[PDB]
Design a protein around this ligand. Structure first.
Ligand SMILES: Nc1ncnc2c1ncn2[C@@H]1O[C@H](COP(=O)(O)OP(=O)(O)OP(=O)(O)O)[C@@H](O)[C@H]1O
Ligand SMILES: Nc1ncnc2c1ncn2[C@@H]1O[C@H](COP(=O)(O)OP(=O)(O)O)[C@@H](O)[C@H]1O
Ligand SMILES: [Zn+2]
Lengths: 48, 247, 100, 49, 354, 455, 247
DNA sequence: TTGTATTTATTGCAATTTTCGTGCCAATTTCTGG
DNA sequence: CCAGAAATTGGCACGAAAATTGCAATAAATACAA
């Protein structure tokens, strides 16, 4: 409902098709936060 | 374009086609008037630098004192009288092809000025302290036997092995009996429109005389004879009488 | 080039231009709802290269269509009312229209 | 002129007149404020003022 | 990719993970992150309205401004995907890669990281066992410090003023080595050892018994053991390369009239780039040190302002006397990412009324 | 004698003393700013006036460590509420939907297969902002990436896409777009079959405005032809312009011209005039007590900075003088618009300001003037002339304006040709040849006489 | 990139390794296409001047009347044309290596103009009143027997011992039979890789032919012949027929 | 009484290319008799 | 009504006028130490 860019489109398509099911992903704001923390010279990364 | 009829000319053209992909310098040997410059221009067109400029120079007229000045250019303070920097022939031919007419006549002393430029491609201007790198393909044409000059102590063998990587031989017109009639017809057609004489062809006697003659000046002498015949004829076809310039 | 406030918009129907006067501005007393045109304006779209297809379009449908694009003022969605007053402000040296 | 325009247009004590009704305007013109340039702030004001 | 079906299927994947790891970044890591180096402080051309080359919005570094088109326009459609134009250098791909491509800036001289100097207790001062006053004086070119003790009576961390350094230089000559700036601190951090300090502090704690000094020794030993166990290195606390944020996360605000205005982050980046370029030019001409020291101090201050504006001394403000927001401001506070966008957010399929 | 010799000589030298501070006239404001940036980078004694300011900040900042009891102890109110709520309980843009976004939204909600969806994605990628397909289907088939697919599948997907909203989008050419639009109409439409026939078979005749061969071939009357043509003209030639995404681009003027007290005042745009300054801090150490290398360095850099500042000031003065002279000469244009602009060449301006024509040519390159009428170029006011009966002159710009005005007020059934346009200009004193009139008409992209008639 | 399979080449390489720390000037003597430039650059790379600029200059490329100006530079006001102070090539290679290519062709007059510079490093510019001290290691290359030219009177004996601190002799390739096969293989590999040729070696008859011909250009002639064969190659293996230009 | 180093004051020519107007003519649109 | 016979336009060429750029460091007035 907020910032899963692919999830929004998939949810809308499924609702129109009559299939009330979602495929969640990663919010975009967390990726923005990762980039902003990296811009400070700190190495933060998703593991495995 | 250019007309090639004899088997030797076809073989030369095929070899040129095969070696056009090669960037090696070429040395061409023959006589005066055999068409070495035409072959060089064909080679330049058939290579990948056809769009690139082609600079052909007759090195038999360059003064010895300004030899380095013309070849390498110079800076502002190189000598007296100069106020501005000047480019060199290699730089002017950078990214293209440089052709040298009558390389056999070159002086032995000046042959040392081209020992390193051909291989290394790096040189300094007069009055300068900066090294310049280029990419120029060297073509040389000569009517003299280079190897004989080397053996008789007149040519620098290092420069020979620098240029003697690809060899081309153009036989004179005396071995081109098949390729006399097409050249004569082409020259007649060209000069008929050039001088508005409207002459079409030749008669049997004129063709026989032109074919039987062992031309020494080759294509140049044949073209001059055709031009003189055009200038001094009024008929539709040129007979043997109008060809009185020959022996 | 300058934008022009005009009543001749190439890409709108005659029904949508019924409420505009000869200067391209709505009449006093008109009842308008969301989506209606209040002031008609056009904007230059540049100098497109005269390709054969562009020449065909200009030949068939006219030149005004191929030179300008619509940038009119429209009533926002969910807004209705009656036009009761119109004011025009013009810079010095610019020609005044009929409404002014 | 720049200072005068800034004061009369973008000061904290210069405001659009409240125009709901005549009482709104009368009340707005007779208003006293402890805030502004040289006054207090609603975070540092206190409790006794 | 050759088959377009798999190519389209593989750009909507979700990354798999089960943990998050944080550490310090070496200059090699920062260089491996980036796609190119930023060299010019310009952003937009204002004549062709296209990004400048090697600028803060360069398409050769950060990506295409249009989907599957390069800057010049030789390659334009999906049939040329994954192709680098040899004329402009722009890849033919999606324009969303401008959200996840970073750049880097090569600094003329080392600069300290303001977070590892101003977050109490100071990490540099705790590792080197020096007061914060001395480190601040050395970093901002107000005093000297000895790097190598030499054969004289000068200690390995002795602070020398102008006159003291002058007389020491004229007396001993070239026996010692004294420096100022971030280079001196980096030299101290690079020339230290951790195991010997650990064992010496452990033996000192074993022998000497105190209350405050025992706490100090415990703090230092904990810091040393943490640094040893972690893969970090002390000299990584001094910046040599500077990361640059992707351009779509710091966009330019367009206004009616064609004015692009400016953003605080872009302004801070431009100031850093200008100072770095001027110092790079000055170092090449062998200019007198009386000017290059001021240039290095100004570069240090600019980097500090970019990283965290207002934490150290004065804060750089805008035209309307408002301090510029830095990266730390974007991260922390009640207006930062955590409070405003991650712990709560606005949603679709919602309404309100009386 | 040819030879490169070193010797002492007594010769006469010419005066090439030129080519200094001359390249600063031909550049625009933006390139001049770039050059100034380079100069500031290379010279430590040059600084430019800025606006950034720095002020001290020492106020304490509240953190989480403040205990809960202390919060209730304090009489003051918190600066920001810890609770995620407002006091009653950086700018970024927004996403916009383009034509391609709308098309992909419709593609997502259509029962396609994976292969068909990839084909549709490629097709929509190959659609421009006017609504037409910019590549042949062969390129799309090549970009699909496998050899198990024919061209009929691509054609079917394209036909499905062409029925999206707007109708007619992703069409190969104009005829295809018009036929697609007509296929959506009902058969009850009166003039449908004739319009369909005209579009399908004879569209170039309508482009050439024949109206004679057209009726002969289609075997129709004049009224039915007019009705069919009006129906065709009611269609949308650019279906992809319903969703308009764009913004106009502007140019910041270099010279401002206004009218105060009935007099034309000309000045420079103060928001864009370049300027520099001398850094006093570095230049204030130029004392002999310091090192000699430092002293010579600072002296050289200071002299260069002062010379550059003088050159910039002279450039600004020259530009202002030239603009003022040009405005003064062309005064009737600013009061009555076009048709009143007198002919002008660089020689007149050079004589008026006592300079060479090269200086005038370089100063007036890529310079823009703002007037109450609009934004123009400084070179726009120079034009040729055509001799007018009685010794007068007529500028080509005025003649073009007159020709456009005459053509714009003609009878549609009888378009004015070059022969009649010359006669109208002949009776006004202008003596302009037919070829020149045709050249002027072509320069305005106006069709010839036979291609402007209407029914 | 460089093949040293002959025992003499290994001896030369070991001697070069022994003189890496040696700073004295060296003189190299050999034939055409033996590898004088390669050996000199290897000496330069193995010395302490590996990262120092290597200025290679040919003496014959400078005009006689500006030889001193190109060798030492000039100061302002020295002559009609001395616009500004200019440094020479010796000052250009400060701290590096200066490579005098083809020192044999140098005239007697020029050899008497550089007797103090090599031994002491001090020379005055044209118009300069200050003494210039430079430190450049000198490597000279020649294709002539200088030890015989000093006796014949065509070379100055004074310069011979100034350039005769270390002398290197490169034997001709016709005696270096351990190099012919490896050099031919390397050249064939390089010319196949560059020309996109599908050849990957010689035939046994071709190998026997390559080890029997009396090569005169030595390595350069071998490279030229290999390139000529590669250009006209028509098979995965090169036979004796392609190498018909030998014998 | 003078000879030298510093500070301002120098924004124009001459090739050279590009463009201006205008006439001639060949491939298209209109005028007139059985 | 229709076919044979008259205006229209844009390419190409001509001379002449106008816009463009390659010349990149100089010279004259003024103050100070012997
Ligand atoms: N060991 C080797 N391995 C590969 N190539 C070699 C070797 N020795 C010599 N060459 C080749 O010999 C060719 C000529 O070398 P070089 O320039 O040294 O010749 P030179 O005539 O002695 O030089 P100069 O006359 O310029 O002093 C080069 O193209 C080089 O590749
Ligand atoms: N294939 C050809 N077709 C037409 N003319 C040729 C051909 N070959 C040679 N020639 C003529 O022979 C002449 C030889 O000129 P050039 O090559 O300059 O001198 P040389 O032959 O002595 O080198 C040229 O002028 C050219 O016209
Ligand atoms: Zn490109």
């Amino acid at each position: 409902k907020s910032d899963d860019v692919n999830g929004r489109t998939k949810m809308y398509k499924n609702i129109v098709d009559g299939n009330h099911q979602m495929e969640p992903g990663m919010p975009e704001s967390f990726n923005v936060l990762l980039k902003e923390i990296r811009s400070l010279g700190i190495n933060i990364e998703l593991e495995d | 374009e250019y007309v090639f009829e004899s088997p030797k000319m076809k073989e030369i053209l095929e070899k040129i086609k095969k070696i056009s992909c090669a960037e090696c310098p070429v040395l061409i040997t023959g006589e005066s008037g055999v068409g070495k410059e035409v072959v060089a221009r064909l080679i330049h067109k058939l290579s990948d630098r056809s769009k690139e400029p082609f600079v052909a120079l007759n090195v038999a007229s360059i003064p010895r004192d300004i030899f380095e000045a013309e070849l390498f250019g110079y800076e502002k303070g190189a000598f007296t009288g100069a106020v501005s920097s000047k480019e060199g022939f290699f730089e002017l031919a950078d990214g293209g092809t440089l052709f040298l007419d009558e390389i056999g006549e070159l002086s032995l002393e000046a042959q040392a000025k081209l020992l390193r430029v051909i291989e290394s491609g790096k040189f300094y201007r007069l009055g300068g302290r900066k090294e310049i790198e280029v990419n120029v393909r060297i073509l040389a044409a000569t009517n003299r036997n280079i190897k004989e000059l080397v053996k008789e102590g007149k040519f620098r063998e290092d420069l020979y092995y620098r240029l003697g990587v690809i060899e081309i031989e153009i036989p004179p017109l005396r071995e081109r009996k098949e390729d006399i009639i097409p050249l004569a017809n082409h020259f007649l057609k060209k000069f008929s429109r050039k001088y508005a004489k409207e002459v079409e062809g030749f008669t049997k006697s004129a063709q026989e005389l032109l074919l039987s003659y062992p031309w020494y000046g080759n294509v140049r002498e044949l073209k001059n004879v055709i031009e003189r015949a055009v200038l001094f004829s009024e008929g539709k076809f040129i007979d043997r009488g109008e060809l009185s310039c020959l022996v | 080039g300058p934008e022009e406030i005009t009543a001749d918009i190439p890409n709108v129907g005659e029904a949508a231009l019924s409420k505009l006067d000869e200067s391209g501005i709505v009449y006093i007393g008109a009842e308008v709802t969301g989506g209606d045109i209040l002031v008609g304006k056009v904007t230059p779209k540049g100098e497109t290269q005269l390709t054969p297809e562009e020449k065909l379009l200009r030949a068939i449908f006219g030149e005004k269509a191929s030179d300008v694009k619509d940038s009119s003022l429209r009533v926002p969605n969910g807004v209705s009312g009656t036009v009761i007053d119109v004011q025009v402000f013009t810079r010095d040296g610019v020609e005044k229209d009929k409404r002014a | 002129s720049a200072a005068v325009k800034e004061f009369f247009g973008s000061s904290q004590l210069s405001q659009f007149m409240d125009q709901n009704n005549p009482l709104s305007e009368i009340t707005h013109k007779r208003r006293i404020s402890a805030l502004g340039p040289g006054g207090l702030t609603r975070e540092r004001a206190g409790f006794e003022v | 990719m050759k088959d377009l079906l798999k190519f389209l299927k593989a750009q909507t994947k979700t990354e798999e993970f089960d943990a998050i790891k944080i550490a310090l970044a070496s200059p090699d890591m920062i260089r491996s992150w980036s796609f190119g180096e930023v060299k010019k402080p310009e952003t937009i051309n204002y004549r062709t309205f296209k990004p400048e080359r090697d600028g803060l919005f360069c398409a050769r570094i950060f990506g295409p401004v249009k989907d599957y088109e390069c800057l010049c326009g030789k390659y334009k459609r999906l049939k040329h995907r994954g192709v680098i134009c040899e004329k402009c250098g722009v890849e033919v791909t999606q324009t969303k890669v401008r959200r996840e491509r970073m750049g880097h800036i090569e600094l003329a001289s080392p600069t300290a990281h303001i977070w590892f100097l101003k977050s109490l207790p100071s990490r540099i001062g705790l590792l080197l066992d020096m007061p914060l006053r001395d480190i601040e004086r050395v970093l901002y070119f107000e005093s000297y410090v000895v790097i190598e003790g030499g054969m004289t009576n000068l200690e390995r961390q002795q602070i020398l003023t102008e006159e003291q350094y002058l007389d020491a230089l004229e007396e001993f000559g070239d026996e010692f080595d004294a420096k100022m700036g971030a280079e001196a601190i980096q030299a101290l951090l690079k020339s230290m050892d951790l195991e010997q300090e650990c064992e010496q502090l452990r033996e000192e704690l074993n022998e000497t018994n105190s209350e405050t000094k025992r706490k100090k020794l415990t703090k230092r030993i904990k810091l040393l053991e943490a640094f040893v166990q972690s893969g970090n290195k002390p000299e990584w606390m001094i910046l040599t390369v500077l990361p640059v944020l992707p351009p779509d996360l710091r966009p330019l605000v367009p206004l009616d009239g064609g004015r692009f205005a400016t953003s605080d982050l872009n302004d801070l980046y431009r100031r850093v780039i200008n100072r770095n370029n001027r110092l790079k030019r000055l170092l090449d001409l062998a200019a007198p040190d009386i000017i290059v020291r001021n240039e290095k101090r100004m570069l240090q201050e600019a980097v500090d302002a970019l990283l965290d504006n207002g934490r150290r001394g004065r804060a750089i403000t805008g035209s309307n006397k408002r301090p510029l927001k830095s990266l730390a401001d974007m991260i922390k506070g009640k207006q930062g990412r955590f409070r405003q966008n991650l712990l709560g957010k606005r949603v679709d399929y919602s309404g309100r009324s009386v | 004698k040819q030879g490169l010799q070193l010797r002492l000589s007594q010769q006469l030298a010419m005066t090439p003393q030129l080519q200094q501070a001359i390249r600063l006239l031909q550049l625009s404001t933006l390139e001049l700013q770039q050059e100034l940036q380079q100069a500031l980078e290379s010279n430590p004694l040059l600084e430019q006036i800025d606006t950034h300011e720095e002020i001290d900040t020492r106020e304490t900042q509240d953190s989480e460590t403040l205990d809960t009891a202390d919060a209730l102890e304090q009489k003051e109110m918190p600066e920001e509420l810890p609770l995620d709520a407002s006091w009653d309980t950086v700018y970024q843009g927004e996403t916009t939907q383009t034509l391609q976004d709308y098309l992909m939204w419709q593609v997502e909600l259509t029962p396609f297969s994976d292969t068909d969806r990839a084909i549709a994605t490629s097709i929509v990628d190959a659609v421009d902002e006017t609504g037409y397909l910019t590549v042949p289907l062969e390129d799309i088939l090549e970009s699909i990436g496998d050899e198990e697919i024919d061209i009929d599948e691509v054609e079917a997907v394209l036909k499905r896409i062409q029925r999206f909203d707007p109708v007619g989008v992703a069409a190969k050419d104009l005829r295809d777009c018009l036929l697609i639009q007509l296929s959506q109409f009902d058969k009850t439409t009166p003039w449908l079959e004739e319009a369909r026939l005209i579009i399908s078979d004879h569209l170039d005749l309508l482009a050439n405005h024949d109206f004679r061969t057209l009726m002969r071939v289609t075997r129709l009357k004049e009224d039915v032809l007019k009705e069919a043509v009006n129906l065709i003209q009611s269609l949308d030639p650019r279906p992809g312009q319903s969703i308009q995404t764009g913004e106009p681009e502007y140019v910041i003027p270099d010279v401002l011209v206004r009218k105060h007290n009935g007099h034309w005042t000309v000045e420079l745009n103060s928001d864009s005039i370049p300027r520099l300054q001398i850094n006093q801090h570095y230049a204030s150490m130029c004392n002999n007590a310091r090192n000699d290398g430092d002293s010579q360095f600072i002296r050289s850099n200071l002299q260069d900075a002062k010379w550059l500042i003088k050159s910039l000031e002279s450039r600004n003065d020259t530009l202002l003088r030239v603009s003022r002279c040009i405005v003064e000469q062309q005064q009737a244009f600013f009061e009555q618009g076009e048709e009143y602009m007198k002919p002008m060449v660089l020689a007149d301006i050079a004589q008026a300001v006592e300079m060479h024509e090269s200086t005038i040519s370089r100063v007036t390159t890529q310079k823009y003037l703002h007037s109450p009428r609009g934004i123009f170029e400084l070179k726009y006011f120079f034009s040729s002339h055509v001799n007018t009966e009685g010794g007068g002159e007529a500028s080509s710009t005025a003649i073009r304006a007159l020709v456009k005005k005459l053509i714009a007020a003609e009878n549609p059934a009888k378009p004015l040709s070059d022969s009649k346009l010359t006669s109208l200009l002949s009776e006004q004193g202008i003596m302009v040849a037919r070829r020149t009139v045709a050249k002027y008409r072509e320069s305005l992209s106006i069709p010839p006489s036979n291609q402007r008639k209407q029914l």
